[PDB]
Design a protein around this ligand. Structure first.
Ligand SMILES: [Cl-]
Ligand SMILES: [Cl-]
Ligand SMILES: [Cl-]
Ligand SMILES: [Cl-]
Ligand SMILES: [Zn+2]
Ligand SMILES: [Zn+2]
Lengths: 279, 279
């Protein structure tokens, strides 16, 4: 039983979000939804999410899951807004509590900020099975880009997050806190051991769908024949040349909260905190 | 007695800073010095200021004034860092207290944030005379870009801030809070009534020095013959098309403090506050 998958490209952040629909029912999940954010003005907008809401409404779907593949450093999540409009259960990999506990310190939030994942309604363990309607699904731990990345298998497909790019772009950076180029190399090996026909759906592109086959032989960074020590050297060498993602500091502190904005002050206004000279 | 003026271009922010030196002594002032700031990482760096420090050290100058022409929305000021290394008296126009009182509310700082200009050691009134060594100087109120802009006359020259651009670029936006396209029009008229040979030194360029003469007849936005109501219409029409300056929210909250970073938290880290959905 194969999922009905609709991709949604966001040109500002190069993010693909997905609606993952059970063909035998109206149940669906939403993967990596984007809350649009203008960092110069601090304006959040709902254009990308409204595309998702309209699709769900057109096809009269019931949102069962709001899935995050990892903690996004390049965009803010629109999960909370979609959850208000469409319902559904907010979910992420269990190792999100490592990112919460680390960045609670880096953002200086105190214990008014819980670091155990309560903001998310489900934390997936490695290998955990679950369903989207009748669809059969499993969550695999695939860390390396971040400590907490998950790949979601759903029928014949896999939502790999930032664990791979399209074969001609290669792989993503691993210099996020807790990221590990060698952990990512072995996460990719796990992905390559899947059936070569598995539909692979990327989180970013700089062109959303490939296969395990295409990747295994044609990925410019981790084709077959690229050993662990070679890849690591190149990954860390490219990472050193990379400036920090523009939205990283706003994105983490929203996304580590499940996509809740920071609390309102007596002002009536909510504020992000931008650590100075910490990175 | 004419000032010895050295210009310093910052390509990241298109800012001209100046060293204004009294030829008959070693006294100088520093105008609009830049603290380099990477907004993605929250990294401040001291490259631009180190150029100023080296010049002061080469020519064995004594910093008497650290002048700001206005509250900068496009860069953070390096006044406090220069003040530590070189000394000197930090100064700005008296109407800085309007910007402090407004943005103390917009940034929700409470009364742990004084709104009377104590962070600056001198607040210039309109028409106030002062000296840089033997040089004769006067501060004119020239609002419009911001409520608090000042033009500094020093001998035969004038540091106009963002009150004008070079004649072929025209004028700057007036949509900052308290800014007023019509106030700016009449500030410019005041500048045009100066002697046509007055050396005019811009704060930005997108090429630092022109004359009142060149401006009066050749400014593409406010040449002679452009009336008050025409200019205002065009200024507000262009302003509406403009996205907010990238660094505006970090820059104001540092510069409204005289260039002090926000306080250290028990973390040991300092934080900017970015209002959400307020602009
Ligand atoms: Cl597209
Ligand atoms: Cl459920
Ligand atoms: Cl130059
Ligand atoms: Cl003095
Ligand atoms: Zn990512
Ligand atoms: Zn300005």
């Amino acid at each position: 039983l194969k999922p009905d998958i609709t991709a949604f490209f966001d040109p500002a952040t190069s993010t693909y979000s997905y609606v993952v629909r059970d063909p035998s029912s109206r149940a669906c999940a939403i993967v990596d939804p984007v809350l649009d954010y203008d960092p110069a003005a601090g304006r959040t907008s709902h254009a990308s999410a409204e595309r998702l809401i309209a699709h769900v409404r057109q096809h009269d779907l019931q949102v069962e899951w709001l899935l995050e593949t990892h903690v996004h450093a390049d965009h803010l999540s629109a999960a909370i807004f979609l959850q208000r409009e469409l319902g559904g259960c907010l979910a992420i990999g269990a190792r999100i509590t490592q990112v919460q506990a680390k960045f609670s310190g880096l953002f200086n939030l105190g214990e008014a900020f819980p670091v155990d994942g309560r903001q998310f309604e489900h934390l997936f363990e490695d290998g955990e099975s679950f369903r989207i309607g009748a669809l059969e699904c499993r969550a695999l731990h695939t860390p390396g880009h971040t400590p907490a990345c998950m790949t979601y298998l759903v029928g014949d497909s896999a939502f790999v997050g930032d664990t791979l790019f399209m074969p001609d772009y290669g792989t993503a950076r691993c210099d996020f806190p807790g990221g590990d180029a060698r952990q990512l190399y072995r996460s990719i090996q796990r992905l390559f051991a899947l059936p070569d026909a598995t539909r692979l759906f990327m989180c970013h592109d700089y062109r959303c769908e490939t296969s395990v086959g295409e990747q295994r032989r044609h990925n410019v960074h981790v084709r077959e024949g690229v050993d662990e020590e070679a890849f690591v050297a190149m990954r860390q060498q490219r990472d050193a040349t990379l400036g920090m993602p523009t939205l990283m500091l706003p994105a983490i502190q929203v996304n580590m909260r499940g996509g809740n904005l920071p609390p309102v002050e007596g002002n009536g206004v909510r504020y992000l905190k931008i650590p100075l000279d910490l990175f």
